[PDB]
Amino acid sequence: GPHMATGQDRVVALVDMDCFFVQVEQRQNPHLRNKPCAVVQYKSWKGGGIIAVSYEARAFGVTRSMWADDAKKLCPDLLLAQVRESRGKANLTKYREASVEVMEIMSRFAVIERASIDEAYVDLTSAVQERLQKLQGQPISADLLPSTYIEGLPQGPTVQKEGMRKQGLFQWLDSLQIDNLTSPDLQLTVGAVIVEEMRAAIERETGFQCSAGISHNKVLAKLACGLNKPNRQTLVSHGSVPQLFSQMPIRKIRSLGGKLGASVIEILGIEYMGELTQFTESQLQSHFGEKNGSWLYAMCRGIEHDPVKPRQLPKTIGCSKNFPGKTALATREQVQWWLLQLAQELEERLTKDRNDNDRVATQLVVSIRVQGDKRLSSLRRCCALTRYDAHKMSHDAFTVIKNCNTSGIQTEWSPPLTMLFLCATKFSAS
DNA sequence: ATTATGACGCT
DNA sequence: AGCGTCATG
Ligand SMILES: [Mg+2]
Ligand SMILES: [Mg+2]
Ligand SMILES: [Mg+2]
């Protein structure tokens, strides 16, 4: 009754750039704009591997993780942009720098959590309180929500998409109680007004379009963001959760798209996230552990407490390269050359990070994969990172991994290495 | 021979 | 610490 908390205490948004690497390339090269186009890494093997796809190209069935030659079978007119190559490897600096552009704009509106290169969570609770104080009880005009969908509406007693969007928005705004400054639905609505403004600012100042979700917590905001892409935002109210979850496959919720979600489905014999409500918190903890069980019990009712962390910068700076099939590194000279290439990219990025952000990394993590290991990482080992010097870092990494060489010969490396990864971690202020 | 990242949990 | 899981541009 009155004591069951409803998880409506915060307003949280998730902003996600649409097809981000494609947009970065389309800004640079106007010939790619409003075209089926994709971004690829490398070229020789099957035309390169696609990592980002414009919505025009998605209409033909082009997806990430598809080889460009195969995508061209689906979409003969597909345009491609290649990721930069430096020191023999893909270099993602252009997209990291574009990400910083966007994150700095978002940070003007609220403190953000950088969830990935192209997405950030926003805690809007305080900004919403402020805007409500300025509103003085004035209703919210639909004109202030020109790209907002209200999930679950319209409902009840036109055949165009924008018409449906506006009917739903109208139903939502008509049912709104604008004099209660503590109404969660009103708070979400003002949150959506702010996110319209943030998305307008991102597009004006960068050229980049994004989608967003507005709800009461991170998981619902992420889910909402995905409901209407691209270039749109979606409000998921607490009240919309029972219907939304009643047909929502468990794998769609962040953290349940892998083994844990599969085990929820198999152990409980259910398919949809709403079906979780029929289990006690202790039942879910018995199957999935204390933490997961409590999380699932609350999440299937729309409630989640994970805070938006005040963190706009990545916690690690890493450099990785796979050496698949026949390109696996089989000589010590080879291993040392590539460790050096990775370490030189790492040094460049670290020195820039130190100048920009007033911090220094203090641990170097070295990870490798050996031929025939099913796992993505075969071995992970840390050592001290005391100097931003590529030759030192690569010599230290070699010292850390050199006992992996099974070869009786010092010149040969066996089993050959199919992946090298250098990562700088544990930053301290400087 | 989907690749290059990045965050976080477990023990 | 080192390993596994989840996300996926
Ligand atoms: Mg995106
Ligand atoms: Mg994203
Ligand atoms: Mg994506």
Tab-separated table of C-alpha atoms (C1' of nucleotides) and ligand atoms in Angstrom:
chain	number	residue	atom	x	y	z
A	1	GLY	CA	0.000	0.000	0.000
A	2	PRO	CA	1.423	3.356	1.108
A	3	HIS	CA	4.805	1.838	2.059
A	4	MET	CA	5.618	-0.104	-1.130
A	5	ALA	CA	8.182	2.090	-2.864
A	6	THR	CA	7.500	2.592	-6.571
A	7	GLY	CA	10.937	3.625	-7.860
A	8	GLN	CA	9.737	7.035	-9.061
A	9	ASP	CA	12.226	9.197	-7.121
A	10	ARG	CA	14.533	10.145	-10.010
A	11	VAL	CA	14.301	11.323	-13.604
A	12	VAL	CA	16.963	9.543	-15.703
A	13	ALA	CA	17.639	9.880	-19.414
A	14	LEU	CA	19.789	7.814	-21.744
A	15	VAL	CA	21.096	9.657	-24.810
A	16	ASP	CA	22.441	7.503	-27.642
A	17	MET	CA	23.933	8.850	-30.869
A	18	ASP	CA	22.313	7.385	-33.975
A	19	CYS	CA	24.669	5.143	-36.028
A	20	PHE	CA	27.493	7.137	-34.489
A	21	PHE	CA	30.583	6.302	-36.540
A	22	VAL	CA	28.501	6.684	-39.729
A	23	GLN	CA	27.377	10.165	-38.646
A	24	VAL	CA	30.984	11.167	-37.936
A	25	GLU	CA	31.975	10.083	-41.461
A	26	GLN	CA	28.877	11.739	-42.993
A	27	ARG	CA	29.677	15.067	-41.345
A	28	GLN	CA	33.185	14.904	-42.774
A	29	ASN	CA	32.091	13.759	-46.255
A	30	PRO	CA	28.773	15.284	-47.414
A	31	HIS	CA	28.624	12.799	-50.312
A	32	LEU	CA	27.746	10.118	-47.740
A	33	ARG	CA	24.823	12.025	-46.223
A	34	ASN	CA	21.302	10.589	-46.552
A	35	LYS	CA	22.691	7.471	-48.251
A	36	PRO	CA	22.899	3.775	-47.397
A	37	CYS	CA	26.346	3.725	-45.929
A	38	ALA	CA	28.416	1.835	-43.424
A	39	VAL	CA	31.762	2.101	-41.645
A	40	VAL	CA	34.251	-0.757	-42.028
A	41	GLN	CA	37.516	-1.814	-40.388
A	42	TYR	CA	40.203	-3.101	-42.796
A	43	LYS	CA	39.521	-4.185	-46.396
A	44	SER	CA	41.450	-7.209	-47.673
A	45	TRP	CA	39.415	-9.948	-45.936
A	46	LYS	CA	35.893	-10.027	-47.437
A	47	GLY	CA	35.903	-6.256	-47.935
A	48	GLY	CA	36.359	-5.419	-44.248
A	49	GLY	CA	34.083	-5.857	-41.254
A	50	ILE	CA	31.148	-3.494	-40.848
A	51	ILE	CA	30.874	-1.832	-37.434
A	52	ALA	CA	28.217	0.866	-38.026
A	53	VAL	CA	25.294	1.142	-40.459
A	54	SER	CA	23.120	4.053	-41.563
A	55	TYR	CA	19.373	3.580	-41.211
A	56	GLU	CA	19.012	3.717	-45.004
A	57	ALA	CA	21.390	0.745	-45.266
A	58	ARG	CA	19.652	-1.091	-42.391
A	59	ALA	CA	16.506	-1.107	-44.547
A	60	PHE	CA	18.372	-3.447	-46.941
A	61	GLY	CA	19.377	-5.771	-44.102
A	62	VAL	CA	22.935	-4.508	-43.632
A	63	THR	CA	24.076	-5.002	-40.030
A	64	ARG	CA	27.118	-4.655	-37.857
A	65	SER	CA	29.379	-7.722	-37.786
A	66	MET	CA	28.771	-8.427	-41.453
A	67	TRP	CA	31.529	-8.471	-44.065
A	68	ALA	CA	31.334	-5.615	-46.553
A	69	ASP	CA	31.313	-8.025	-49.523
A	70	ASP	CA	28.184	-9.681	-48.105
A	71	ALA	CA	26.553	-6.343	-47.320
A	72	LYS	CA	27.121	-5.372	-50.974
A	73	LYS	CA	25.131	-8.447	-51.971
A	74	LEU	CA	22.181	-7.049	-49.979
A	75	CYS	CA	22.770	-3.409	-50.966
A	76	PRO	CA	24.756	-2.990	-54.178
A	77	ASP	CA	24.826	0.801	-53.843
A	78	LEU	CA	26.068	0.727	-50.241
A	79	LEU	CA	28.666	3.410	-49.592
A	80	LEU	CA	31.571	2.619	-47.297
A	81	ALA	CA	33.895	4.663	-45.128
A	82	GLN	CA	37.012	3.012	-43.674
A	83	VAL	CA	38.363	3.492	-40.166
A	84	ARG	CA	41.799	5.108	-40.175
A	85	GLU	CA	44.792	2.779	-39.966
A	86	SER	CA	47.881	3.851	-37.999
A	87	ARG	CA	50.880	1.721	-37.026
A	88	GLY	CA	49.295	-1.239	-38.772
A	89	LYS	CA	46.031	-1.209	-36.827
A	90	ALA	CA	42.634	0.416	-36.705
A	91	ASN	CA	42.772	3.817	-35.007
A	92	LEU	CA	39.527	5.140	-33.521
A	93	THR	CA	40.742	8.629	-32.506
A	94	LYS	CA	38.335	10.502	-34.817
A	95	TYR	CA	35.327	8.890	-33.114
A	96	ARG	CA	36.696	9.353	-29.597
A	97	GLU	CA	37.200	13.074	-30.294
A	98	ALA	CA	33.677	13.370	-31.721
A	99	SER	CA	32.389	11.632	-28.587
A	100	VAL	CA	34.087	14.230	-26.391
A	101	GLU	CA	32.294	16.964	-28.416
A	102	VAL	CA	28.923	15.436	-27.616
A	103	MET	CA	29.677	14.619	-23.965
A	104	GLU	CA	30.816	18.182	-23.281
A	105	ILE	CA	27.541	19.573	-24.650
A	106	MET	CA	25.479	17.155	-22.557
A	107	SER	CA	27.430	18.111	-19.436
A	108	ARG	CA	26.074	21.703	-19.701
A	109	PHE	CA	22.612	20.415	-18.827
A	110	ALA	CA	23.405	17.904	-16.090
A	111	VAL	CA	26.067	15.602	-14.735
A	112	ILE	CA	26.462	12.618	-17.044
A	113	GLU	CA	27.744	9.041	-16.899
A	114	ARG	CA	29.687	8.035	-20.029
A	115	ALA	CA	28.306	4.576	-20.665
A	116	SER	CA	30.035	4.085	-23.997
A	117	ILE	CA	31.689	6.009	-26.832
A	118	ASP	CA	28.286	7.175	-27.993
A	119	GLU	CA	25.912	7.022	-25.069
A	120	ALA	CA	25.498	8.693	-21.717
A	121	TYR	CA	23.060	8.570	-18.840
A	122	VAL	CA	21.777	11.866	-17.454
A	123	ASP	CA	20.396	12.424	-13.954
A	124	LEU	CA	17.755	15.079	-14.562
A	125	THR	CA	16.043	15.083	-11.147
A	126	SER	CA	17.441	18.444	-10.008
A	127	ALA	CA	17.150	20.130	-13.417
A	128	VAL	CA	13.505	19.024	-13.489
A	129	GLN	CA	12.868	20.513	-10.032
A	130	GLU	CA	14.388	23.769	-11.289
A	131	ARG	CA	12.352	23.912	-14.494
A	132	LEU	CA	9.165	23.111	-12.559
A	133	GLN	CA	9.869	26.039	-10.231
A	134	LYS	CA	10.251	28.282	-13.288
A	135	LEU	CA	7.070	26.891	-14.880
A	136	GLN	CA	4.915	28.296	-12.046
A	137	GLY	CA	2.284	25.628	-12.717
A	138	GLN	CA	2.089	26.458	-16.423
A	139	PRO	CA	0.995	23.454	-18.529
A	140	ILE	CA	3.413	21.752	-20.902
A	141	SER	CA	2.663	22.501	-24.538
A	142	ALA	CA	2.974	19.699	-27.086
A	143	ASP	CA	5.120	22.185	-29.014
A	144	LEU	CA	7.843	21.647	-26.421
A	145	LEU	CA	7.920	17.895	-27.194
A	146	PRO	CA	8.212	17.814	-31.002
A	147	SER	CA	10.098	14.497	-31.227
A	148	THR	CA	8.731	12.690	-28.133
A	149	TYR	CA	6.810	9.401	-28.085
A	150	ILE	CA	4.830	8.353	-25.004
A	151	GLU	CA	5.143	4.573	-24.751
A	152	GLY	CA	1.759	2.851	-24.527
A	153	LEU	CA	-0.206	5.705	-26.053
A	154	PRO	CA	-2.466	6.317	-27.828
A	155	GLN	CA	-4.897	3.843	-26.321
A	156	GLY	CA	-8.620	3.289	-26.286
A	157	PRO	CA	-11.810	4.501	-28.036
A	158	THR	CA	-5.206	8.546	-39.214
A	159	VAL	CA	-2.711	6.086	-40.689
A	160	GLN	CA	0.531	8.095	-40.452
A	161	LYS	CA	3.390	7.719	-37.973
A	162	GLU	CA	3.677	11.363	-36.915
A	163	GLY	CA	-0.106	11.454	-36.430
A	164	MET	CA	0.027	8.481	-34.054
A	165	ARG	CA	2.928	10.109	-32.193
A	166	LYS	CA	0.937	13.318	-31.684
A	167	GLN	CA	-2.292	11.525	-30.628
A	168	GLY	CA	-0.330	9.681	-27.948
A	169	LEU	CA	1.353	12.862	-26.787
A	170	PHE	CA	-2.023	14.592	-26.649
A	171	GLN	CA	-3.575	11.832	-24.522
A	172	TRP	CA	-0.572	11.988	-22.201
A	173	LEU	CA	-0.635	15.754	-21.785
A	174	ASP	CA	-4.414	15.798	-21.316
A	175	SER	CA	-4.129	13.363	-18.427
A	176	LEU	CA	-1.348	15.399	-16.769
A	177	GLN	CA	-1.728	17.026	-13.324
A	178	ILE	CA	0.420	20.157	-13.687
A	179	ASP	CA	-0.088	21.690	-10.216
A	180	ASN	CA	1.520	18.798	-8.284
A	181	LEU	CA	5.256	19.549	-8.325
A	182	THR	CA	5.843	16.025	-6.956
A	183	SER	CA	3.839	14.151	-9.645
A	184	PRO	CA	6.260	11.586	-11.154
A	185	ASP	CA	4.499	11.712	-14.537
A	186	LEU	CA	4.852	15.507	-14.633
A	187	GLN	CA	8.500	15.195	-13.633
A	188	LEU	CA	9.155	12.753	-16.466
A	189	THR	CA	7.421	15.145	-18.871
A	190	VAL	CA	9.589	18.087	-17.829
A	191	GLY	CA	12.564	15.738	-18.145
A	192	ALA	CA	11.540	15.093	-21.733
A	193	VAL	CA	11.330	18.848	-22.368
A	194	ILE	CA	14.912	19.204	-21.142
A	195	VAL	CA	16.063	16.265	-23.285
A	196	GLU	CA	14.474	17.850	-26.358
A	197	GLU	CA	16.593	20.924	-25.599
A	198	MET	CA	19.763	18.856	-25.019
A	199	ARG	CA	19.255	16.944	-28.288
A	200	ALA	CA	18.596	20.201	-30.153
A	201	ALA	CA	21.851	21.619	-28.757
A	202	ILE	CA	23.822	18.511	-29.738
A	203	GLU	CA	22.512	18.684	-33.307
A	204	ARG	CA	22.982	22.450	-33.651
A	205	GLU	CA	26.553	22.400	-32.333
A	206	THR	CA	27.854	19.127	-33.832
A	207	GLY	CA	25.576	18.131	-36.708
A	208	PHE	CA	24.892	14.805	-34.964
A	209	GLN	CA	21.433	13.372	-34.323
A	210	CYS	CA	20.591	11.115	-31.416
A	211	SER	CA	17.766	9.247	-29.777
A	212	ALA	CA	16.948	9.237	-26.103
A	213	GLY	CA	14.906	7.535	-23.419
A	214	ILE	CA	13.393	9.265	-20.383
A	215	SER	CA	12.230	7.239	-17.383
A	216	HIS	CA	12.818	6.758	-13.648
A	217	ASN	CA	16.028	4.720	-13.816
A	218	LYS	CA	18.833	3.693	-16.138
A	219	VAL	CA	17.412	0.349	-17.360
A	220	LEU	CA	14.064	1.829	-18.313
A	221	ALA	CA	15.724	4.848	-19.920
A	222	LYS	CA	17.926	2.573	-22.054
A	223	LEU	CA	14.954	0.414	-23.019
A	224	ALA	CA	12.902	3.512	-23.830
A	225	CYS	CA	15.667	4.953	-25.989
A	226	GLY	CA	15.489	1.880	-28.223
A	227	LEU	CA	11.737	2.044	-28.831
A	228	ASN	CA	11.755	4.852	-31.439
A	229	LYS	CA	15.002	5.251	-33.372
A	230	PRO	CA	16.360	7.206	-35.090
A	231	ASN	CA	16.233	10.913	-34.139
A	232	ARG	CA	13.386	10.496	-31.635
A	233	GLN	CA	12.936	10.249	-27.875
A	234	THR	CA	10.612	8.056	-25.817
A	235	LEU	CA	9.074	8.586	-22.372
A	236	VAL	CA	8.440	5.359	-20.411
A	237	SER	CA	6.281	6.087	-17.380
A	238	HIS	CA	6.047	3.884	-14.318
A	239	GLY	CA	2.440	3.154	-15.301
A	240	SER	CA	3.497	1.917	-18.738
A	241	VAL	CA	5.645	-0.872	-17.308
A	242	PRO	CA	3.047	-3.697	-16.829
A	243	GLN	CA	1.890	-3.599	-20.454
A	244	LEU	CA	5.370	-2.966	-21.853
A	245	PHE	CA	6.876	-5.853	-19.901
A	246	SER	CA	3.982	-8.242	-20.549
A	247	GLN	CA	5.328	-8.997	-24.061
A	248	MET	CA	9.001	-7.933	-23.553
A	249	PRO	CA	11.477	-10.805	-24.084
A	250	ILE	CA	13.783	-11.059	-21.082
A	251	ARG	CA	16.856	-10.661	-23.315
A	252	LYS	CA	15.913	-7.075	-24.214
A	253	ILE	CA	16.690	-5.747	-20.725
A	254	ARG	CA	20.272	-4.569	-20.169
A	255	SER	CA	22.359	-7.316	-18.449
A	256	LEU	CA	19.936	-10.118	-19.403
A	257	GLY	CA	20.909	-10.552	-23.043
A	258	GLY	CA	23.448	-13.301	-22.259
A	259	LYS	CA	23.872	-16.402	-20.100
A	260	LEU	CA	21.996	-15.088	-17.042
A	261	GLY	CA	18.953	-14.193	-19.119
A	262	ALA	CA	19.016	-17.581	-20.810
A	263	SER	CA	19.054	-19.237	-17.391
A	264	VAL	CA	16.131	-17.115	-16.144
A	265	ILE	CA	14.173	-18.349	-19.174
A	266	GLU	CA	15.173	-21.988	-18.757
A	267	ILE	CA	14.971	-22.325	-14.962
A	268	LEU	CA	11.684	-20.496	-14.541
A	269	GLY	CA	10.062	-21.599	-17.805
A	270	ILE	CA	9.066	-18.051	-18.776
A	271	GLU	CA	9.603	-15.806	-21.807
A	272	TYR	CA	8.693	-12.221	-20.869
A	273	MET	CA	9.964	-9.830	-18.272
A	274	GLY	CA	6.482	-9.315	-16.769
A	275	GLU	CA	6.235	-13.014	-15.931
A	276	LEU	CA	8.916	-12.465	-13.296
A	277	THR	CA	6.430	-10.754	-10.999
A	278	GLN	CA	4.919	-14.110	-9.966
A	279	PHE	CA	8.047	-15.169	-8.046
A	280	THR	CA	9.022	-14.100	-4.532
A	281	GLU	CA	12.230	-12.210	-3.942
A	282	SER	CA	13.561	-15.255	-2.066
A	283	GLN	CA	12.688	-17.572	-5.024
A	284	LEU	CA	14.605	-15.336	-7.421
A	285	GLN	CA	17.559	-15.095	-5.009
A	286	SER	CA	17.583	-18.879	-4.656
A	287	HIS	CA	17.984	-19.307	-8.389
A	288	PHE	CA	20.143	-16.325	-9.364
A	289	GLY	CA	21.959	-15.191	-6.225
A	290	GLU	CA	21.215	-12.538	-3.623
A	291	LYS	CA	22.163	-9.572	-5.814
A	292	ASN	CA	20.617	-10.715	-9.089
A	293	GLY	CA	17.509	-12.011	-7.336
A	294	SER	CA	16.813	-8.692	-5.602
A	295	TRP	CA	17.597	-6.839	-8.820
A	296	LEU	CA	15.194	-8.997	-10.860
A	297	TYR	CA	12.452	-8.731	-8.235
A	298	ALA	CA	12.553	-4.941	-8.401
A	299	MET	CA	13.338	-4.626	-12.124
A	300	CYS	CA	10.330	-6.591	-13.302
A	301	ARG	CA	8.179	-4.030	-11.428
A	302	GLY	CA	9.987	-1.115	-13.127
A	303	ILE	CA	12.274	-0.334	-10.156
A	304	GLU	CA	16.056	-0.089	-10.279
A	305	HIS	CA	18.411	1.884	-8.080
A	306	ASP	CA	21.794	1.979	-9.890
A	307	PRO	CA	22.964	5.618	-9.751
A	308	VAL	CA	24.057	7.758	-12.648
A	309	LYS	CA	27.751	7.950	-11.784
A	310	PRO	CA	29.400	11.363	-12.229
A	311	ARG	CA	31.980	10.152	-14.730
A	312	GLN	CA	32.425	11.703	-18.179
A	313	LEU	CA	35.864	10.172	-18.921
A	314	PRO	CA	36.764	6.530	-19.584
A	315	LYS	CA	38.406	4.701	-16.654
A	316	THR	CA	40.807	2.825	-18.929
A	317	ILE	CA	42.676	3.573	-22.145
A	318	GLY	CA	43.409	0.447	-24.183
A	319	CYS	CA	44.823	-0.733	-27.520
A	320	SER	CA	43.961	-4.171	-28.950
A	321	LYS	CA	44.601	-6.139	-32.152
A	322	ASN	CA	43.522	-9.586	-33.292
A	323	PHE	CA	45.768	-11.690	-35.511
A	324	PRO	CA	43.277	-14.180	-36.925
A	325	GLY	CA	43.908	-17.430	-38.737
A	326	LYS	CA	47.121	-17.305	-40.714
A	327	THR	CA	48.253	-13.857	-39.480
A	328	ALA	CA	48.947	-15.180	-35.949
A	329	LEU	CA	52.314	-14.033	-34.606
A	330	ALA	CA	54.826	-16.889	-34.676
A	331	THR	CA	58.201	-15.176	-34.145
A	332	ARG	CA	59.601	-13.192	-31.229
A	333	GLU	CA	60.500	-10.375	-33.626
A	334	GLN	CA	56.842	-10.250	-34.692
A	335	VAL	CA	55.505	-10.195	-31.132
A	336	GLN	CA	57.906	-7.430	-30.173
A	337	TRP	CA	57.101	-5.348	-33.254
A	338	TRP	CA	53.360	-5.452	-32.622
A	339	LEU	CA	53.719	-4.850	-28.884
A	340	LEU	CA	55.684	-1.772	-29.879
A	341	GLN	CA	53.002	-0.602	-32.334
A	342	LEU	CA	50.291	-0.973	-29.689
A	343	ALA	CA	52.464	0.716	-27.082
A	344	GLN	CA	53.169	3.660	-29.383
A	345	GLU	CA	49.452	4.218	-29.942
A	346	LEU	CA	48.901	3.852	-26.186
A	347	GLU	CA	51.636	6.388	-25.396
A	348	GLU	CA	50.125	8.915	-27.799
A	349	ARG	CA	46.670	8.539	-26.289
A	350	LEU	CA	47.990	8.600	-22.700
A	351	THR	CA	50.047	11.742	-23.230
A	352	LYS	CA	47.011	13.493	-24.708
A	353	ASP	CA	44.861	12.221	-21.807
A	354	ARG	CA	47.333	13.577	-19.240
A	355	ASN	CA	47.347	17.020	-20.859
A	356	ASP	CA	43.555	17.159	-21.251
A	357	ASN	CA	42.391	15.595	-18.020
A	358	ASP	CA	45.064	16.120	-15.320
A	359	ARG	CA	45.588	12.462	-14.494
A	360	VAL	CA	48.121	9.673	-14.959
A	361	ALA	CA	47.598	5.941	-15.319
A	362	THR	CA	49.597	3.770	-12.950
A	363	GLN	CA	48.916	0.161	-14.043
A	364	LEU	CA	49.569	-1.532	-17.378
A	365	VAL	CA	47.429	-4.612	-18.157
A	366	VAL	CA	48.775	-6.996	-20.829
A	367	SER	CA	46.382	-9.513	-22.349
A	368	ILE	CA	46.971	-12.136	-25.027
A	369	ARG	CA	45.160	-14.949	-26.787
A	370	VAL	CA	46.902	-18.102	-27.992
A	371	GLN	CA	45.848	-20.133	-31.013
A	372	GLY	CA	43.116	-22.642	-30.221
A	373	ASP	CA	41.821	-21.080	-26.995
A	374	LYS	CA	38.051	-20.646	-27.044
A	375	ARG	CA	38.196	-17.699	-24.634
A	376	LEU	CA	38.748	-14.198	-25.976
A	377	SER	CA	41.549	-13.641	-23.443
A	378	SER	CA	44.051	-16.396	-22.745
A	379	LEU	CA	46.222	-14.559	-20.228
A	380	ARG	CA	45.951	-11.251	-18.358
A	381	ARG	CA	48.825	-9.861	-16.305
A	382	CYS	CA	49.458	-6.471	-14.730
A	383	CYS	CA	52.650	-4.536	-14.164
A	384	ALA	CA	53.612	-1.063	-13.017
A	385	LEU	CA	53.131	1.808	-15.454
A	386	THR	CA	55.615	4.407	-14.191
A	387	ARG	CA	56.573	6.224	-17.431
A	388	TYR	CA	54.638	7.131	-20.592
A	389	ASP	CA	57.275	5.606	-22.856
A	390	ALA	CA	56.279	3.153	-25.594
A	391	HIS	CA	59.569	1.232	-25.669
A	392	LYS	CA	59.463	0.758	-21.901
A	393	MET	CA	55.806	-0.282	-21.982
A	394	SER	CA	56.375	-2.796	-24.799
A	395	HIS	CA	59.476	-4.241	-23.138
A	396	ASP	CA	57.531	-4.584	-19.858
A	397	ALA	CA	54.639	-6.252	-21.684
A	398	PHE	CA	57.036	-8.690	-23.347
A	399	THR	CA	58.659	-9.454	-19.994
A	400	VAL	CA	55.213	-10.080	-18.541
A	401	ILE	CA	54.168	-12.522	-21.303
A	402	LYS	CA	57.459	-14.104	-22.386
A	403	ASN	CA	57.020	-17.224	-20.235
A	404	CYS	CA	53.990	-18.063	-22.412
A	405	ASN	CA	56.261	-19.095	-25.281
A	406	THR	CA	56.146	-22.912	-25.362
A	407	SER	CA	58.804	-22.995	-28.108
A	408	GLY	CA	62.121	-24.479	-27.089
A	409	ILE	CA	63.618	-22.077	-29.627
A	410	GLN	CA	64.030	-18.505	-28.401
A	411	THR	CA	63.370	-17.130	-31.902
A	412	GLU	CA	60.038	-18.891	-32.473
A	413	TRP	CA	56.791	-18.200	-30.640
A	414	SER	CA	54.390	-21.105	-30.143
A	415	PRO	CA	51.534	-21.496	-29.898
A	416	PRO	CA	51.212	-18.383	-32.085
A	417	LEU	CA	49.429	-15.361	-30.656
A	418	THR	CA	45.999	-14.403	-32.085
A	419	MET	CA	45.509	-11.258	-29.954
A	420	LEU	CA	47.546	-8.565	-28.168
A	421	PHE	CA	45.952	-6.047	-25.782
A	422	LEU	CA	47.601	-3.260	-23.754
A	423	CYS	CA	45.458	-1.333	-21.286
A	424	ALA	CA	46.334	1.595	-19.015
A	425	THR	CA	44.336	1.617	-15.780
A	426	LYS	CA	44.153	3.010	-12.216
A	427	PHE	CA	44.382	6.721	-12.883
A	428	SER	CA	45.549	9.169	-10.224
A	429	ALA	CA	45.090	12.920	-10.339
A	430	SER	CA	48.143	14.917	-11.350
B	1	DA	C1'	38.680	-14.341	-40.122
B	2	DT	C1'	32.829	-10.319	-37.036
B	3	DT	C1'	37.131	-6.449	-34.453
B	4	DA	C1'	38.288	-2.840	-30.992
B	5	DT	C1'	37.137	-1.430	-27.337
B	6	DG	C1'	34.944	-0.540	-22.185
B	7	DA	C1'	32.475	-1.404	-17.686
B	8	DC	C1'	31.680	-4.319	-13.898
B	9	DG	C1'	31.139	-8.817	-10.988
B	10	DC	C1'	33.313	-12.936	-8.791
B	11	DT	C1'	36.501	-15.126	-5.782
C	1	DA	C1'	44.980	-9.981	-8.714
C	2	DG	C1'	43.279	-12.666	-12.642
C	3	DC	C1'	39.182	-14.323	-14.759
C	4	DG	C1'	34.425	-14.140	-16.642
C	5	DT	C1'	30.220	-11.628	-18.382
C	6	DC	C1'	27.836	-8.172	-20.972
C	7	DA	C1'	27.669	-4.596	-24.158
C	8	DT	C1'	28.569	-3.548	-29.286
C	9	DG	C1'	31.001	1.501	-32.431
D	1	MG	MG	24.245	4.672	-30.930
D	2	MG	MG	25.445	3.275	-27.823
D	3	MG	MG	24.273	-0.240	-31.789
